[PDB]
UniProtKB/Swiss-Prot annotation, chain A:
Gene3D superfamilies: GroEL (3.50.7.10), GroEL-like equatorial domain (1.10.560.10), TCP-1-like chaperonin intermediate domain (3.30.260.10). Keywords: Acetylation, ATP-binding, Chaperone, Cytoplasm, Nucleotide-binding, Phosphoprotein. CDD domains: TCP1_zeta. One of its GO terms (biological process) is chaperone mediated protein folding independent of cofactor. InterPro entries: Chap_CCT_zeta, Chaperone_TCP-1, Chaperonin_TCP-1_CS, Cpn60/GroEL/TCP-1, GroEL-like_apical_dom_sf, GROEL-like_equatorial_sf, TCP-1-like_intermed_sf. Heterooligomeric complex of about 850 to 900 kDa that forms two stacked rings, 12 to 16 nm in diameter. It comes from Saccharomyces cerevisiae (strain ATCC 204508 / S288c) (Baker's yeast). This is T-complex protein 1 subunit zeta. One of its GO terms (cellular component) is chaperonin-containing T-complex. It is found in: Cytoplasm.
Length: 527, 529
């Protein structure tokens, strides 16, 4: 009286809706999506994972898709949208086989067999790149892969030297690793995004405000001042008793002698070492505040005074400059002074930034992203953080893979002809391998669809070119050119993808998409 | 003032085609299902013929209208494959509809079919097998006749109709160039006896026979003589009667009615004395299309002369060919050469109707297929199986080429067309996308036969491909086909499953143009009112 429930037709269709959304924004020809919270928050981001965190989906099928990208950002850091396109399209290709009566286990097991065979073809297709530091010229084209995706390509040439020189400056040449936490990103509005420049040192928030402070100081010594220069009180509890206002200044000056005594010891250090020597300077950090009386004292000696510094930024100044933190003025020593180059302070009424740049061994970098609007700050920041992590796996892993659908078209061609020659799996496995082979061709068709060129013509020109290369007995890599619409050589164009990015993308999208077909029924319980 | 376009049709046309496809999908093959269709007539009829299904149902959907016209053209030419073509048109639209979302233009889809159709004719000429016109092929004709019979019945009736259908064509058709005529084979319908007891009739049978208790049951070697004169009393055009009040007036008034009767009757009984008087084991039979008077009933009983009355005019014209005797309008001009020749003549005894067997003739040059059944729907199904069997064998004698069935032609053609364009690469890069849809659409037939039987269509597909791979390495020729009973592959030459060449030749070309025209309509046009 009861037979099964057929099930399905709910998870595949719900996953098809998420694919159509993320199909348009994939690649450098994609689109920039905008989300609205309703409280006044507006964010424009082309990344898939960043958008899924701000979107609530009731369908549990798309929930695991967002959770599948959690391991991609923490490891690969790039290609979150590409993984989603491989999960959705694989379900559409398998949908036709399910209606024919094919059991999903063979469909699931057929994907794992093709996944292990893809790893063998993955090691043959990859190219080993040397660890020499002369590859920076080659790293310029590699950095463009992440940049051209998130922007309109007008700011790519500006951000190309900034992202490239940020990692290589803090990285000595050895195996080691690279740490992107040492690169701080700050933002200031009321300026154009084309003014973005590279900062070698650290940018400080609160700048010195005074007309007589020197703007440019070359070869100045950095000194960390931990004592408070603000108003001080007597070490014992007392009070100010004055009959007239003239008597109050006498009692107030008694407590000011404690600060004035420390200021006389600081100014003596400047004239002691290279006081009258040209091209010399003395700069006081002074994390704590500054009283209004010391502004005129430091102005006569052309000393840069700063106050209200963040505790986190002070830890980097000790590494960049080298000067130790001096708690007491009586214990101040000439060896505490550090080293710095030309320091120029940009004058702006809203904010004033102090440049710590031009140091011998800074071991730090700063990427300053400035834009007038709100979306200009978030869009560029998404491209830099994705650009630093894309190059991160390039220097760590010696293997590099060409992009623009080079590996996707090649692997789909290899797995097609290899299944007929081997025939060691099973006769019913062909349905799982053919579905996986056709699911890899959606990425080159997705990139060209956003450009407007016919995806049918670009598919035929690449397949006809690969067949002519085998008869010529040589190795020639072919890729999809989005600008012209024909094929291209990915080695000459400069489109390259990291090995660790595509390794977890194919493996990750295979295991998550296979688990979706394994669901027999959706149960609602707990309420 | 916008250039945005719509589909609105192809998605509905394929959906309407998939609905009609599933109706005839389970109705195809010997293992298919038999569906009942009754529209307004209260008459139960069960048949698997695809053409009869569409004519008995009124479909408002415009998609099934063109499909209905495709079955009418295949019956008037090929006479078979009505359901197979419908299954090919519907499945081809499914593979073509998936490429529409990709952006494939329907003209290249139609152009890709013409390229694959011309290439299919090259493989069609190599795969076909020429059959000899020799009359020793009756053993091979038994295997071909069962292929058409097993489809429309439960397979229990096939063994009964196997000798009947095979001997029906060979008996009426002498072996020469000539031609064959299926209209010369009579068809009689009877609802009395069960269909398991049906038999073949070599001669001609008639409806109304003579009824007398003393008529002989069996008459061997009887002479057939056509008699056009009335042996029954006749009356004036105006109603009148002869009433006698005395015994003397009885013979006076009755003599006027028997004057024409006695003149012809006395001359007929003289023929029995001069001809066939002494000769034993012979008989004499009178046709007598008109009625019979009660006076001649006693005369025919003493001489054991079989009497007949109320004969069909169309049947008497064929009696001149079977028996050989010419129609005699006047007994005065009757000659001894007018008497024909017939074999054993015996009449079955049934209360409602009676039969007459002219069978066992030297040169009958005619046949009669007697259809028996208990119910009404059993007669309609059996009549459909006989008419489909005669037209299937009709193309066997006309066309010397024969093709094996059971998916042997479709699997080999779908595999050949896929590997032919990859090696040659002489068509186009974009066109081969639509060509693959035509190759995958030819594998639905072997998957449909195993679907009704409950077998895995993917399992039987991989088993055939494994056998074809071993056949490509060796230089010999070995054909592979799907076995529905066992579930594994089979040799179609040993099993005996064969399909006509003319039916399958117009099936590929016919289904190509019908399925292509459905893809050429972008927008449905509603006008005229």
């Amino acid at each position: 009286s009861l037979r099964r429930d057929a099930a399905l037709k709910v998870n595949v269709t719900s996953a098809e809706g998420l694919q159509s959304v993320l199909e348009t924004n994939l690649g450098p020809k994609g689109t920039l999506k905008m989300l609205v919270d309703g409280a006044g928050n507006i964010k424009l981001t082309k990344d898939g994972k960043v958008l899924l965190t701000e979107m609530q989906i009731q369908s549990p099928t798309a929930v695991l898709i967002a959770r599948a990208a959690a391991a991609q950002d923490e490891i690969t850091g790039d290609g979150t949208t590409t993984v989603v396109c491989l999960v959705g399209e694989l379900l559409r290709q398998a949908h036709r086989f399910i209606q024919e009566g094919v059991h999903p286990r063979i469909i699931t097991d057929g994907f794992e067999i093709a996944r292990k065979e893809s790893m063998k073809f993955l090691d043959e297709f990859k190219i080993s790149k040397t660890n020499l530091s002369n590859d920076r010229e080659f790293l310029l084209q590699v950095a463009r892969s992440s940049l051209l995706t998130k922007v309109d390509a007008d700011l790519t040439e500006v951000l190309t030297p900034i992202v490239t020189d940020a990692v290589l400056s803090v990285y000595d040449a050895q195996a080691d690793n690279l740490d992107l936490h040492m690169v701080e990103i700050m933002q200031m509005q009321h300026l154009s995004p084309k003014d973005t420049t590279f900062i070698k040192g650290l940018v400080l928030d609160h700048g010195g405000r005074h007309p007589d402070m020197p703007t440019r100081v070359k070869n100045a010594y950095v000194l960390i001042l931990n004592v408070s220069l603000e108003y001080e009180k007597t070490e014992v509890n007392s009070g100010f008793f004055y009959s007239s206002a003239d008597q109050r200044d006498k009692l107030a000056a008694s407590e000011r002698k404690f600060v004035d005594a420390k200021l006389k010891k600081i100014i003596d250090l400047k004239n002691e070492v290279c006081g009258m020597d040209p091209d010399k300077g003395f700069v006081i950090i002074n994390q704590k505040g500054i009283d209004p009386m010391s502004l005129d004292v430091f102005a006569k000696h052309n000393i840069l005074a700063l106050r209200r510094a963040k505790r986190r930024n002070m830890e980097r100044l000790q590494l960049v400059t080298g000067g130790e933190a001096q708690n007491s003025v009586e214990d101040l020593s000439p060896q505490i002074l550090g080293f710095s180059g030309l320091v120029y302070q940009e004058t702006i009424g809203e904010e004033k930034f102090t440049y710590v740049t031009e140091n011998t061994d800074p071991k730090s970098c700063t990427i300053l992203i400035k834009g007038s609007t709100h979306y200009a700050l978030a869009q560029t920041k998404d491209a830099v953080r994705d650009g630093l992590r894309a190059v991160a796996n390039v220097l760590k892993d010696k293997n590099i893979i060409p992009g623009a659908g080079a590996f996707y078209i090649a692997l789909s061609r290899y797995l097609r002809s290899a299944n007929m020659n081997k025939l060691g799996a099973k006769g019913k496995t062909k349905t799982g391998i053919e579905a996986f082979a056709e699911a890899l061709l959606v990425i080159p068709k997705t990139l060209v669809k956003n450009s407007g060129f016919d995806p049918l013509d670009v598919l035929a020109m690449v397949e006809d070119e690969l067949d002519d290369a085998q008869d010529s007995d040589e190795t020639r890599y072919v890729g999809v050119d989005l600008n012209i619409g024909d094929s291209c050589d990915p080695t000459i164009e400069g489109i390259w993808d990291s090995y660790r990015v595509l390794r977890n993308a194919i493996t990750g999208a295979t295991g998550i998409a296979s688990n979706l077909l394994l669901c027999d029924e959706l149960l609602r319980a707990g309420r």
